[PDB]
């Protein structure tokens, strides 16, 4: 299966996040790193982008997910706000799944959409900038989790967020 080779972009990462040495993994620490505050860096929300974004075409990757609450992942428009506390909503240009309250959610607004998908281990993300959609599938049977249909009007970046300790996200391949 042809998947994009992605690495987490340390210049974007919230300083509380810990990125693995291979730049595939992210979790939350309780120590803020002393990092330079670039305009691209998420200074309050616990977010990081991949270093690669996309303006056209179709792209796949997979995300290995922790069993416990605290993560959300998907894609963000490049213009996603980086500074101060921002909402985690489609209006803010984030299109994500989340594990919170021991429930899986598609992060719709104003109310999140609870998913009855069973336990998740690894999720395939299918980003389609030709038709305007981002879809999520559980890898065991490729059951469909959710599709956001979006007329994306800018470059779209893989998005990861971890807002509590005790969980993680990891990029494959």
């Amino acid at each position: 299966h042809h998947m994009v080779e992605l690495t987490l972009d340390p210049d974007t990462a919230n300083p509380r996040l810990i990125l693995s040495l291979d730049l595939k993994g992210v979790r939350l620490g309780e120590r803020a790193q002393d990092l330079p505050n670039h305009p691209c860096r998420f200074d309050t929300n616990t977010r990081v982008l991949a270093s690669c974004g996309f303006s056209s075409g179709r792209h796949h990757w997979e995300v290995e997910v922790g069993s416990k609450d605290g993560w959300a992942f998907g894609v963000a428009r490049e213009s996603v706000r980086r500074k101060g506390l921002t909402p985690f909503t489609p209006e803010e240009g984030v299109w994500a799944l989340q594990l919170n309250g021991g429930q899986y959610w598609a992060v719709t607004s104003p109310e999140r959409s609870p998913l009855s998908c069973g336990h998740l281990s690894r999720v395939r993300v299918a980003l389609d900038l030709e038709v305007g959609a981002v879809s999520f599938y559980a890898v065991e049977d490729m059951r469909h989790l959710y599709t956001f249909r979006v007329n994306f009007q800018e470059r779209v970046f893989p998005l990861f967020s971890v807002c509590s300790t005790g969980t993680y996200l990891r990029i494959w391949p």
Binding site: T44, N45, L85, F88, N100, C163
Partner: peptide, 5 residues
């Protein structure tokens, strides 16, 4: 809980 997501 997810305020900072």
């Amino acid at each position: 809980e997810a305020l900072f997501q």
